[PDB]
Design an enzyme around this catalytic site. Structure first.
Site, short mmCIF file in Angstrom:
data_model
loop_
_atom_site.label_atom_id
_atom_site.label_comp_id
_atom_site.label_asym_id
_atom_site.label_seq_id
_atom_site.Cartn_x
_atom_site.Cartn_y
_atom_site.Cartn_z
N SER A 197 0.86 -1.20 0.00
CA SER A 197 0.00 0.00 0.00
C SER A 197 0.90 1.24 0.00
CB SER A 197 -0.95 -0.03 1.22
OG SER A 197 -1.94 0.99 1.18
N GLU A 324 -8.73 -5.32 -4.25
CA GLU A 324 -8.13 -4.17 -3.59
C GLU A 324 -9.10 -3.10 -3.05
OE1 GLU A 324 -5.09 -4.08 -2.87
OE2 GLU A 324 -3.86 -5.14 -4.36
N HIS A 437 -7.43 -6.11 0.53
CA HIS A 437 -6.26 -5.26 0.53
C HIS A 437 -5.41 -5.59 1.75
CE1 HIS A 437 -4.00 -1.66 -0.44
NE2 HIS A 437 -4.24 -1.12 0.74
#
Lengths: 532, 532
Positions: A197, A324, A437
């Site tokens: 991320s 995601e 995610h």
């Protein structure tokens, strides 16, 4: 003594830790910068002053001051990401896991945590480097850096809050690894930085920034790239948000000096309480204080750097997760709930689209809606839900990473791409969220090897494969064993664009990861918004 | 005598003709307007003056002056559409096929030929009404009307070339059918007008035009609707093309009178030789002289007429062919050939897109290209060919007809929709062209019932079904037999939007005929071009 190490900053005392019924050394909470407090807030980090005596590095350090998610009190699913230590502005420390017996000159891996540049900690359970250091025999380092306004307040033109200081923090941690990891058995000429991320975006920024390029050898980027629409802002938007931050705390706004001074007299939680009030649009997947294109850390705009080959040329391994976006829809889009199938109406679908592409005019919103709607079944609640889920992930993570990999591969010395699509059997989040995610992280750090966590046999096998890929790549620049008999992770080339799936099934190679949409998000839409 | 008929214009003498080993009466070449020659060129038609004696209606009349396709000398495929009689400006006649014995008051069907408003004849072999009149026992009428500049030169504001005179021709033919068909056994209160391509567009224009509405009961539209991007122009574009026509023939352009007079002194073939030089863009599927929104024939813009319900409310039956565009790509797009598979390169694909959507800016061309490209296989010659084929058909025929049917059904009294996807076994055109524009016509007129033409048994069966549908609809307003046991052609409703396929396989009902694309061509693109 195996637990005593003499660095260029002073002596350090580690601790012995059990792992998979064995042991390794751990040096926790080693300082790499002076505490950024008082007058130092928002300021660039300074090197830690050497110390006499022995530094006790047997316990985790504090976590940086940050926003704490309370959307689901008690829920492990979300609290496993919250800070698990006292928060404090005195947060710049690093952690090192060293094999036993201590290596002489082995491969190093420096992990940079994610968290949208507004949260994150090196001390979370999912980031315990002991399993990986033990299993693959590498020196594992996890650094920390300031987040939120504390690490990204940007008032370009001044030296009191230049911006990007959070990235300089990471760079300093890397500078220390470069100057001292040799004393822990690590090879400084073979350090791989990897993150997820915002951490994956950070890794890509060190690849681009001239001042960071010489501090590492290779890089791994998970679900994040430097050119993501959320990872950076202009000096103008940076200035605009800094001022608005000051307005929410009733600060004198006549000059940068006036504003900065007022912000330095405020308690940490006072800036955090109003941090989310400065976003320019009603949005999803956007954060207040993030890196800014200042002409220093980043010489020019990122897109021109990527086109001119102005970046560190080396090998990189990167990929994304199947779903995601579900996480940001759960917390911020009307219609989604943790305890239901979240079937979405046409109403909420278009409502969510407006929240996902905040900077788009009506023509643009219509383009997106047309691209993600099946007009033969437009009121299908499950199709609108997954459609909204794809949009958020494609626009924010997948299409931006594909643009990077394609631009990079033209000048790099080797690219390896993956698509992680295995949903862990022990996930506490609902099914509609899919391969969430940040949940590939646990396989990278080897949590499936510990029985008590309850993973399956195939999930443990998958973790060892991924750990061996990441580690084998860190050491050689290729995730594959030289003369292995296993399936080969093909190299990604401008021509074929091959990539592999990462799950518990027999490896399969594919091509052009989500090209249809990536062309829409990287070529068509930008053009549409610029003409209209 | 069965072959002698006394109309309000004078007596008429027909001829007896053999059909499927039987006989019916035919009255060929009956005049319905004064010859539009000399000073009458470009002028509105005048009613034919009654005549004494008996008019010999035993042979086909001449064909209107028109452009003749010579792209494939000898090739039946294209010559079966060329005029098969001497061309002449004296062309306003109609043909009638009457059952034997002569009916007392039976259903009437008036056919309006297509041809892009620049060609066409009522005398082509494929338009022989004898098979249909015989098999379904209906009075079949085929009219004629002026095409090209002769029927559509438009200099709004003057009475010498008002425009739309070609449509007034059709209206006059219908006026005659209304005043005289009773003497041929036809019921004037039950006339169905039907046509294909420009003829289908003409049928829809009579539904919209106040002055034509009361002259027919029902309507059938095949592969054409009034709102097609090629079926009409503004008074301004009409004026612009008329002048440019005059410039190609070196005419005095100081005034409409000057121009018109010069154009009236020119031989027919002189205007036809330069007719194609007035198009505004390099294009495919566009014609020089077509109907024009003048505020008379058409009160206001067509889109506002369709939204306000300003049109004849009745039942309509319409549909399209699977591959409506291949014909115009063959004649005008680089890369296509009659004698090859015509696999298209990326080069020619985008080149063809520019030719198909001539009025689009670069952003628009990119939108179309993205909508019709499979980026996982972008250099697939067969996918680019069919992609280009779909574009031409969708934009020019299918998406425009779907917009009409959906707008109409909101105020009509019954809609029936079909999708013709059967490629005749005896087609001489290459396979890549598929179910070609205008080849459903032969099934409507029953050519498959004649052995010597070489159709299959299933193709003959299909022809009888279609003929019975068209005829049963003409008589009752519903293509289905009251208490039949066969499959029912469901009614098309705003809600379900059901339609059927028309081929030799067991009927199947579907929904939302090409919605994905129709939404792109009717909602998104127009909006894009208007904002940018």
């Amino acid at each position: 003594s195996e637990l005593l190490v003499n660095t260029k900053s002073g002596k350090v005392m580690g601790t012995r830790v059990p792992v998979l019924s064995s042991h390794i050394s751990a040096f926790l909470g080693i300082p790499f910068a002076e505490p950024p407090v008082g007058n130092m807030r928002f300021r660039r980090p300074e090197p830690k002053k050497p110390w006499s005596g022995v530094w006790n590095a047997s316990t985790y350090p504090n976590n940086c001051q940050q926003y704490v998610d309370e959307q689901f009190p008690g829920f492990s699913g979300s609290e496993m990401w919250n800070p698990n230590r006292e928060m404090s502005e005195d947060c710049l420390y690093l952690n090192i896991w060293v094999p036993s017996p201590r290596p002489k000159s082995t491969t190093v891996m420096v992990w940079i945590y994610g968290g949208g540049f507004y949260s994150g900690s090196s001390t979370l359970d999912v980031y315990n480097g002991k399993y990986l250091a033990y299993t693959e025999e590498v020196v594992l380092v996890s650094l920390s850096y300031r987040v939120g306004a504390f690490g990204f307040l940007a008032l370009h033109g001044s030296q009191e809050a230049p911006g990007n200081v959070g990235l300089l923090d990471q760079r300093m941690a890397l500078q220390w690894v470069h100057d001292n990891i040799q004393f822990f058995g690590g090879d400084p000429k073979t350090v791989t930085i990897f993150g997820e991320s915002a951490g994956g975006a950070s890794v890509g920024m060190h690849i681009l920034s001239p001042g960071s390029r010489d501090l590492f050898r290779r890089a791994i980027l998970q679900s994040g790239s430097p050119n993501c629409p959320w990872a950076s802002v202009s000096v103008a938007e940076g200035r605009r948000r800094a001022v608005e931050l000051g307005r929410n705390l009733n600060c004198n706004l006549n000059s940068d000096e006036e504003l900065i001074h007022c912000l330095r007299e405020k308690k940490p939680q006072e800036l955090i309480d109003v941090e989310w009030n400065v976003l320019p649009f009603d949005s999803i997947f956007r954060f207040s204080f993030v890196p800014v294109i200042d002409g220093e850390f980043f010489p020019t705009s990122l897109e021109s750097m990527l086109n001119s080959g102005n970046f560190k040329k080396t090998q990189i391994l990167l990929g994304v997760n199947k779903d995601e976006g579900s996480f940001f829809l759960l917390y911020g889009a009307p219609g989604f709930s943790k305890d239901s199938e979240s079937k979405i109406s046409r109403e909420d679908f278009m409502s969510g689209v407006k929240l996902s592409v905040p900077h788009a005019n009506d023509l643009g919103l219509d383009a997106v809606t047309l691209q993600y709607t099946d007009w033969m079944d437009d009121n299908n609640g499950i199709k609108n839900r997954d459609g909204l889920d794809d949009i958020v992930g494609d626009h924010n993570v997948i299409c931006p990473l594909m643009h990077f990999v394609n631009k990079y591969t033209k000048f790099g010395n080797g690219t390896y791409l993956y698509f992680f699509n295995h949903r862990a059997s022990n996930l506490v989040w609902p099914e509609w969220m899919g391969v969430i995610h940040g949940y590939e992280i646990e396989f990278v750090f080897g949590l499936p090897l510990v029985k008590e966590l309850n993973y399956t046999a195939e999930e443990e096998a998958l973790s060892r494969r991924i750990m061996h890929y990441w580690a084998t790549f860190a050491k050689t620049g290729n995730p594959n064993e030289p003369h292995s008999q296993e399936s080969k992770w093909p190299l990604f080339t401008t021509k074929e664009q091959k990539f592999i799936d990462l799950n518990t099934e027999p490896m399969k190679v594919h091509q052009r990861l989500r090209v249809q949409m990536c062309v829409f998000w990287n070529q068509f839409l930008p053009k549409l918004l610029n003409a209209t």
